[PDB]
Amino acid sequence: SRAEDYEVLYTIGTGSYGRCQKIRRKSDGKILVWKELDYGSMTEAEKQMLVSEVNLLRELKHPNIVRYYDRIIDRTNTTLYIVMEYCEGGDLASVITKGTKERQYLDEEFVLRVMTQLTLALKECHRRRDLKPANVFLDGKQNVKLGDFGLARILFVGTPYYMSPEQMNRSYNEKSDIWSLGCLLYELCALMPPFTAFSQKELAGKIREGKFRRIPYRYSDELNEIITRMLNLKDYHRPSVEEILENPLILEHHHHHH
Numbered sequence: 204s205r206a207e208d209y210e211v212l213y214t215i216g217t218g219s220y221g222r223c224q225k226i227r228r229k230s231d232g233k234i235l236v237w238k239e240l241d242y243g244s245m246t247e248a249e250k251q252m253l254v255s256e257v258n259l260l261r262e263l264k265h266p267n268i269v270r271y272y273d274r275i276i277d278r279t280n281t282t283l284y285i286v287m288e289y290c291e292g293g294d295l296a297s298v299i300t301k302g303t304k305e306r307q308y309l310d311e312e313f314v315l316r317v318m319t320q321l322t323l324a325l326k327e328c329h330r331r332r333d334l335k336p337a338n339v340f341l342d343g344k345q346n347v348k349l350g351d352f353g354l355a356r357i358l359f360v361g362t363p364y365y366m367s368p369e370q371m372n373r374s375y376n377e378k379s380d381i382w383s384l385g386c387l388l389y390e391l392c393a394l395m396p397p398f399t400a401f402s403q404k405e406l407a408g409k410i411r412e413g414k415f416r417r418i419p420y421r422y423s424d425e426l427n428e429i430i431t432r433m434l435n436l437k438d439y440h441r442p443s444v445e446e447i448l449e450n451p452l453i454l455e456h457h458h459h460h461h
C-alpha cells in the first residue's frame with residue numbers, strides 16, 4: 204500500500220490535526236476517501252493505541268457500516284492515511300441542517316430507510332461507532348452507513364443531547380443505544396432533538412421527565428409510535444433491534460441495495 208497508488212481529487216473536510224480527502228484509486232479508478240493523520244507528535248503509546256484502533260476498523264464488514272479499505276504509512280512526512288468508502292450523499296447532520304434552514308421536512312420513506320439500515324448497523328455492532336447525525340452517511344444508492352466517529356475525533360463544550368436516562372446515572376447497555384437511535388430518528392423528523400436545553404443540568408431535568416413534542420403530523424402515527432417507544436424512560440420498555448425490524452412499517456425496499 205503506497206500513497207502513490209492514489210490521487211487526491213480534493214479536500215472534503217479539515218480538522219485541527221488532519222484532513223479528509225476524496226481520492227481516486229489509480230488501478231481501477233475507484234472513488235474513495237482517506238483520513239490523513241500526522242502522527243509525528245505522537246508518543247509510542249499513542250501510536251500503539253492508534254494501530255489497535257485501526258485494526259478494529261478492519262474487523263467490521265457490513266453493508267450499513269462505512270467500509271475500511273486500506274491504511275498507508277508515509278514515514279517520510281510521518282503521515283498515516285486511512286482509506287475508506289466514499290459516501291456521495293454526505294452525513295445526516297448536513298441533511299438536518301439543510302431541512303432546518305430551508306424549512307423542509309424529510310420524507311417518511313427516507314426516515315424509514317434510516318431507521319431500518321441503522322438498526323441493522325447497530326445489530327452488527329452488538330454482535331461485536333456513535334449514533335449521531337454527523338456519524339451517519341449516505342451513498343448514491345439510497346443506502347445508509349454508520350461511520351467511525353473515532354476518525355472525526357482524530358482529525359466537553361457540546362451538549363449531550365442523546366444521552367440516555369440510565370447513562371446519565373452511571374450505559375453498558377444495548378437498550379441505551381436504542382434510546383440514542385430514537386433521538387436521532389426524532390431529530391430527522393422534527394429537525395430538532397427531542398430534549399433541548401442550554402446547559403447539561405437543564406437537559407438532564409428534561410430527560411428525566413421524559414416528555415417531548417410529537418414528531419410532525421406529516422409523519423404516520425405508526426412512525427411516531429415506534430420513535431416514542433425508543434424514547435421510553437425504562438430501558439426494558441424500549442424495543443430491541445429485533446422488535447424494531449418486525450415493525451409493519453419496515454419493508455424490503457427500506458434495506459440496503461447494491
Ligand SMILES: C[C@@H](Oc1cc(-n2cnc3ccc(OC4CCN(C)CC4)cc32)sc1C(N)=O)c1ccccc1C(F)(F)F
Binds near residue numbers: 288290350351358
Ligand atoms: C471526519 C469525517 O469522517 C468521515 C467522512 C466520511 N465520508 C465518506 N464519504 C463522504 C462524503 C462527504 C462527507 O462529508 C460531507 C462533505 C462536506 N459537507 C458540507 C458535509 C458532508 C463525508 C464522507 S466517512 C467518515 C467516518 N468517520 O466514518 C467527516 C464526518 C462527518 C462530516 C464530514 C466529515 C469530513 F468532512 F471530514 F469528511
Ligand SMILES: [Cl-]
Binds near residue numbers: 308
Ligand atoms: Cl419546517
Ligand SMILES: [Cl-]
Binds near residue numbers: 310311312422
Ligand atoms: Cl412524508
Ligand SMILES: [Cl-]
Binds near residue numbers: 266460
Ligand atoms: Cl449496500
